Write a protein that binds this ligand. Structure first.
Ligand SMILES: CC(=O)N[C@@H]1[C@@H](O)[C@H](O)[C@@H](CO)O[C@H]1O
Ligand SMILES: *[C@@H]1O[C@H](CO)[C@@H](O)[C@H](O)[C@H]1NC(C)=O
Ligand SMILES: *[C@@H]1O[C@H](CO)[C@@H](O)[C@H](O)[C@H]1NC(C)=O
Ligand SMILES: *[C@@H]1O[C@H](CO)[C@@H](O)[C@H](O)[C@H]1NC(C)=O
Ligand SMILES: *[C@@H]1O[C@H](CO)[C@@H](O)[C@H](O)[C@H]1NC(C)=O
Ligand SMILES: *[C@@H]1O[C@H](CO)[C@@H](O)[C@H](O)[C@H]1NC(C)=O
Ligand SMILES: *[C@@H]1O[C@H](CO)[C@@H](O)[C@H](O)[C@H]1NC(C)=O
Ligand SMILES: *[C@@H]1O[C@H](CO)[C@@H](O)[C@H](O)[C@H]1NC(C)=O
Ligand SMILES: *[C@@H]1O[C@H](CO)[C@@H](O)[C@H](O)[C@H]1NC(C)=O
Ligand SMILES: *[C@@H]1O[C@H](CO)[C@@H](O)[C@H](O)[C@H]1NC(C)=O
Ligand SMILES: *[C@@H]1O[C@H](CO)[C@@H](O)[C@H](O)[C@H]1NC(C)=O
Ligand SMILES: *[C@@H]1O[C@H](CO)[C@@H](O)[C@H](O)[C@H]1NC(C)=O
Ligand SMILES: *[C@@H]1O[C@H](CO)[C@@H](O)[C@H](O)[C@H]1NC(C)=O
Lengths: 1002, 216, 49
């Protein structure tokens, strides 16, 4: 049987308290929402394994348990742990007492310590050598199934065990179901309140809803896609296509050899057309030193080599470090040179008993004199006499004439420091030449159209193997792409050409609605067939979870290639080709004109981040906080600290500069009159309220209410405080509402708000008479729009979306800087005083090199993130400075820049490290539907409107402006005479009223 | 250059492709590659945002009327061709023709594929052919193209009367001017300089990343 | 790209989606309108002047 385990199987990890924060822990936990076993207790207590620990859950009415047992025979013959709590004499010992088959309660020792209706939970874990006890009891009132709720078990006697026990037994109630589960290293996201009791937790690797919670570290999700993980279909098996040759290689010719060359004439034996196993070389204990930095000793069998040369010679036991890249010595410079880029492995077994004889092994010879250094792997057989002096040497040794090729003497009577030692360079150069010495591994059959772990001639990887039509030449082995990664291979068994394209992979994105809306999920496997995976396949790939619909809606949560989901009809997530709007065909003609009779003065809230936190991260107190030696090593880098501190102080003074450039653009400070009579325009939402403790707006109070360390990093306070930015915002807002635009230009010129809005209508091409006829209606419309944006900013989180997110990238910018106090960068620990109190000065200098280089990788990229993000802030801040300039200090005649629609003005309200504008705009609402003509002819003359458009309902010809239907008869104060009517096309015959004509006739 | 190939590298795949040891040693650097992945996905999303701000400023679907009685201004070279299998312009076809991986770094497909980027461009062209400036601000108001040129003439302070007086002449000059665009855009490779250089620039950036896979 | 793309957005807004009075902002000469054209990762404007 199985039953639902909602939130059980959980324990506390440590004794540490966390407050109002979300933290992720991995440990041996029990997965959530999992079907766990339900058992009965009538007429049943089997033995369960304990290899991973247990989560125990019991329902009890008389506490029927008398001992947790851990041993082999459990009958006082051996060591077995015992637990008995008889309410005053708690005992936890491991000696030999005789227990029954089923211990029960009715209502060599190693430690000693004294401490339905009921639910009791117990957990036992085994790390690091002590003795734990977990215990937690809670009352329940339920008999059918598991109650819903989260109780977190806290170890009372917390002392981590570490005993290896893989077997335990349960003690069931027999005067009742119990839960038992298997434990796995799975990570959850456990929620701490301010108070110390864990209230909720998410197994974040359960469904895509929880996979959002892994990366968002929260319990509520926003409607959107999230990069959760990297899906890559796992290759099913392992494939190897080594060449067919299987003969045993004469490694006895180079190891079991009767004759070894010397360093002057060392044998360079190409080893090819054989099988190199190396396994007998591992099993041989004959080698004493097995040195190489190129290849590894032990993990070499899976590799197949280009061509291996066995350089056989003899040199002294102290000379074994001379065979190394970059080593300089007598024999190293006169007999055998190793390149710095030497690949291959030199082997030196002991030759205590082989290359020696009683009289002296006198056949090993070496050069001691040369006037030049040696090339790598050269063959110098020079037999000339070296010239020591200036005298010519006619083959006559003696003074100034010695011969370089010197010999050795090897005897078993000689000392072990002079005893012959064997060193052999099995030079494993992995070069271009074809692979011929592969490992002793059996081959497998070939697979196509399915990605598989391939190991072709030593090159490992995953990918698909299809036949190729390229004519690889004989001795042509691989096809490399631009990355020199193997793109094509020739199969060494069958002469065919095989492309390598690495296997299908991509990120895991999630389509989900909000957790307040639904729990139905959608997981994405992108840019693939639905083969390595209600399935929808597009150019973006396979979308698993949402229903494909042919009907197209507005796009809400995009997943790729313009296929996106939405949660409608019962309701479910539906994926479709995105509609690019409402399908609005326009009845175009050469005489079709559309003119709005009606508008709405909508106010669009565009929110621009204009400042930030004036951070000043001094390098000494950040990287080398409370340390003298770290600062002494940091000043060895010279000018990085002074230039980055100059950069940060430049950031701070430039944030003050741009907040001055966006607010203190006026030389003179204005204050509102005590009477807020502004012609019907309710400014009490935007003007500061004297009843508030800070002289700030009600809209700003919303901006401050819901719309919102000490590790060497600080914030500098702005020069313009919260109250000061408030008083600039009120000053420039008063300057607008009492002076129009002139206060930003020169002396402040008084204008009433009706006059101001009249001319700001005039500035976009709508005549101010519409305002002065409908001032009451537009007062109602603007005030109701203020109330609407009041509701929007008080009810929608995205009203602070594009500012709060900037506050966020600042927040996790500084927070990841703090994470570099916890991320290690190659050191042993990231805690500075832990390093300085433990780690020695020499490698302490190179790990401070790592912390300076990497802490300034994170930090200099945090600072270039400050400077590129501040190119964003400065672009938006010069943008906002111009928005202040020709929207607050002026009026923007430039369209769709200072708000959606025709911009009229904007209201600066202060915001935390930013500014918000209320771009008051003119948006038409509905139009009546008219015919037109390019010009009109009255007396043979062509007429054109100076301002506005000739319009017609089909019976009468009117002229109206482009953006309001204001029906006026055609007037010579709105039109003129230019040209004649026979050349213009589309002109129609009409009559022109003149503002001169009835005055002349009457 | 408005947008870029949404390149996105993986902490696992690009830096330490298919290696548990190297992925562990990169998580040894902590969140360091995670803000890099965050930054590159941010570049992807803001590139989408650039494309959205330049194209999906439009709130509706505008389509061209079946008749191109545009007052003498033939747009069949700049407007999508119904005879073409993909509804794109002819000059866009020569912008697609004359001017035009699996190894740890991928390219994310755009949220807007090429055909429906062309659909947004067709929408913007349609709005500025039959509706002009009005659909940018508010409701779609149908206005003739002759009116748009005549009122646009007023903007620069020349009177619109000259336009209707020489409508046929300027139709000839503007159509032949678009033809000169067609000829130059089809003949000189230098005419695509500011996009060819930037697509190449991204290509050399990716290619240098590729060349670091040879660098030791 | 984003500076030139906000430039392109204002360009499209003020030069496609409206008429710009900014002299020498929409190519050389007195700007009339502009025609968007899609291109591989770019926009080609046909600024009539
Ligand atoms: C559309 C139009 O121009 N209609 C008539 C035109 O045919 C006529 O020659 C002229 C003489 O008054 O009156 C007008
Ligand atoms: C749910 O319980 C049933 C009972 O047989 C079992 O078959 C199934 O595997 C369980 N589901 C999960 C996800 O464990
Ligand atoms: C109760 O426990 C104590 C030790 O904890 C033990 O010595 C005693 O025998 C127990 N009592 C019974 C009745 O088993
Ligand atoms: C938190 O602890 C306080 C005591 O500090 C207590 O009054 C309260 O009930 C606890 N729980 C909650 C949910 O506040
Ligand atoms: C080389 O000598 C060792 C020494 O015992 C021996 O074990 C090994 O098998 C020999 N190699 C041959 C015979 O190939
Ligand atoms: C090769 O020959 C040249 C001239 O004969 C000589 O200088 C050089 O040392 C020689 N190198 C070797 C490795 O023999
Ligand atoms: C060598 O490889 C080819 C590949 O098909 C095969 O025909 C032949 O049997 C192989 N040699 C041996 C001894 O199996
Ligand atoms: C997807 O699979 C089908 C058949 O399995 C194949 O024809 C097609 O080319 C594949 N496409 C991709 C992009 O893998
Ligand atoms: C405008 O008037 C024409 C003429 O009757 C009509 O066909 C059309 O549907 C009307 N409405 C629109 C939006 O064009
Ligand atoms: C114009 O629009 C407003 C709001 O959209 C509406 O209340 C009003 O009745 C409309 N008509 C007139 C004549 O104002
Ligand atoms: C302005 O709005 C407030 C909102 O509380 C309202 O009480 C007041 O009557 C409105 N009008 C004036 C002139 O203050
Ligand atoms: C407008 O175009 C229609 C056809 O689309 C045509 O019948 C009509 O005569 C044209 N009118 C003018 C004034 O060009
Ligand atoms: C379309 O443009 C071409 C230019 O190649 C021109 O020859 C043709 O007359 C135009 N058609 C119309 C209907 O304007």
């Amino acid at each position: 049987a199985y039953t639902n385990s909602f939130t059980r199987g959980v324990y506390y990890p440590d004794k540490v308290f966390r407050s109002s924060v979300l933290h992720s822990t991995q440990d041996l936990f029990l997965p959530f929402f999992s079907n766990v076993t339900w058992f009965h207790a009538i007429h049943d207590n089997p033995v369960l394994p304990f290899n991973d620990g247990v989560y125990f859950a019991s329902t009890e009415k008389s506490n029927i348990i008398r001992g947790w047992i851990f041993g082999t025979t459990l009958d006082s013959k051996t060591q077995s742990l015992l637990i008995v709590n008889n309410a005053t004499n708690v005992v936890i010992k491991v000696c030999e007492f005789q227990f029954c088959n089923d211990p029960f309660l009715g209502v060599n020792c190693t430690f000693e310590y004294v401490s339905f209706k009921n639910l009791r939970e117990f957990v036992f874990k085994n790390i690091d050598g002590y003795f734990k006890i977990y215990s937690k009891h809670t009352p329940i009132n339920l008999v059918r199934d598991l109650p819903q709720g989260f109780s977190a078990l806290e170890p009372l006697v917390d002392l981590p065990i570490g005993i290896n026990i893989t077997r335990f037994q349960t003690l069931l109630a027999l005067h009742a179901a119990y839960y038992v589960g298997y434990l796995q290293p799975r990570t959850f996201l456990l929620k701490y309140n301010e108070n110390g009791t864990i209230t909720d937790a998410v197994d974040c690797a359960l469904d895509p809803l929880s996979e959002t919670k892994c990366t968002l570290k929260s319990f509520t999700v926003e409607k959107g896609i999230y990069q959760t993980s990297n899906f890559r279909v796992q290759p099913t098996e392992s494939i190897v296509r080594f060449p067919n040759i299987t003969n045993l290689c004469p490694f006895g010719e180079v190891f079991n050899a009767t004759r070894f060359a010397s360093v002057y004439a060392w044998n360079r034996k190409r080893i090819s057309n054989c099988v190199a196993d190396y396994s007998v070389l591992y099993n041989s204990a004959s080698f004493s030193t097995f040195k190489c930095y190129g290849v590894s000793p032990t993990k070499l069998n899976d590799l197949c080599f280009t061509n291996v040369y066995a350089d056989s010679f003899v040199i002294r036991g102290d000379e074994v470090r001379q065979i190394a890249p970059g080593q300089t010595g007598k024999i190293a410079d006169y007999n055998y040179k190793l390149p710095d880029d030497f690949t291959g492995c030199v082997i030196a077994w002991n030759s205590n008993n082989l290359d020696s004889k009683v009289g002296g092994n006198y056949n090993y010879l070496y050069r001691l004199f040369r006037k030049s250094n040696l090339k790598p792997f050269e063959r110098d057989i020079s037999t000339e006499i070296y010239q020591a002096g200036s005298t010519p040497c006619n083959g006559v040794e003696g003074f100034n004439c010695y011969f370089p090729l010197q010999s050795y003497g090897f005897q078993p009577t000689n000392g072990v420091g002079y005893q012959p030692y064997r060193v052999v360079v099995l030079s494993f150069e992995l070069l271009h030449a074809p692979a011929t010495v592969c490992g002793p591994k059996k081959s497998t059959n070939l697979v196509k159209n399915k990605c598989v772990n391939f190991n072709f001639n030593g090159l490992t990887g995953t990918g698909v193997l299809t036949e190729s039509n390229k004519k690889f030449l004989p001795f042509q082995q691989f096809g490399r792409d631009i990355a020199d990664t193997t793109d094509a291979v020739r199969d060494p068994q069958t002469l065919e050409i095989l492309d390598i394209t690495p296997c299908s992979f991509g990120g895991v994105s999630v389509i989900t609605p909000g957790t307040n809306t639904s729990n139905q999920v959608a997981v994405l496997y992108q840019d693939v067939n639905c083969t390595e995976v209600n399935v929808f396949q597009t150019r973006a790939g396979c979308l698993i979870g949402a229903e494909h619909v042919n009907n197209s809606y507005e796009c809400d949560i995009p997943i790729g290639a313009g296929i996106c989901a939405s949660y409608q009809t019962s309701q479910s997530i539906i994926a479709y080709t995105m509609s690019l709007g409402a399908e609005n065909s326009v009845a175009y003609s050469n005489n079709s004109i559309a003119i709005p009779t009606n508008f709405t003065i909508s106010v669009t809230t565009e929110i621009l981040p204009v400042s930030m936190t004036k951070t000043s991260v001094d390098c000494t107190m950040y990287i080398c906080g409370d340390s003298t030696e770290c600062s002494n090593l940091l000043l060895q880098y010279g000018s990085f600290c002074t230039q980055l501190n100059r950069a940060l102080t430049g950031i701070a003074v430039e944030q003050d500069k741009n907040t001055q450039e966006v607010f203190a653009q006026v030389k003179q400070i204005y204050k509102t009159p005590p009477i807020k009579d502004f012609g019907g325009f309710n400014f009490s939402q935007i003007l500061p309220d004297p009843s508030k403790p800070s002289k700030r707006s009600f809209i700003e109070d919303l901006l401050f209410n819901k719309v919102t360390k000490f590790n060497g990093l600080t914030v500098l306070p702005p020069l313009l405080t919260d109250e000061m930015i408030a008083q600039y915002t009120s000053a420039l807002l008063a300057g607008t509402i009492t002076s129009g635009w002139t206060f930003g230009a020169g002396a402040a010129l008084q204008i009433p708000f009706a006059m101001q809005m009249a001319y700001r209508f005039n500035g976009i091409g709508v005549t101010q008479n519409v305002l002065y006829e409908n001032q009451k209606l537009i007062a109602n419309q603007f005030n109701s729009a203020i109330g609407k944006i009041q509701d929007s900013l008080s009810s929608t989180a995205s009203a602070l979306g594009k500012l709060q997110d900037v506050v966020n990238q600042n927040a996790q910018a500084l927070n990841t800087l703090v994470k570099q106090l916890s991320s290690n960068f190659g050191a042993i620990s990231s805690v500075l005083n832990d390093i300085l109190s433990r780690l020695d000065p020499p490698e302490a200098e190179v790990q401070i090199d790592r912390l300076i280089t990497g802490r300034l990788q994170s930090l200099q990229t945090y600072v270039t993130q400050q400077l590129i993000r501040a190119a964003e802030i400065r672009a938006s801040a010069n943008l906002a400075a111009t928005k202040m300039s020709e929207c607050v200090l002026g009026q923007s005649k430039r369209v769709d820049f200072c708000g959606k629609g025709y911009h009229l003005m904007s209201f600066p309200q202060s915001a935390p490290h930013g500014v918000v504008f209320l771009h008051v705009t003119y948006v038409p609402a509905q139009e009546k539907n008219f015919t037109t003509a390019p010009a009109i002819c009255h007396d043979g003359k062509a007429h054109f409107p100076r301002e506005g458009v000739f319009v017609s309902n089909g019976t009468h010809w009117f002229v109206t402006q482009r953006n309001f239907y204001e029906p006026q008869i055609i007037t010579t104060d709105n039109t003129f005479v230019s040209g004649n009517c026979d050349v213009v096309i589309g002109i129609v015959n009409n009559t022109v009223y003149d503002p001169l004509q009835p005055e002349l006739d009457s």
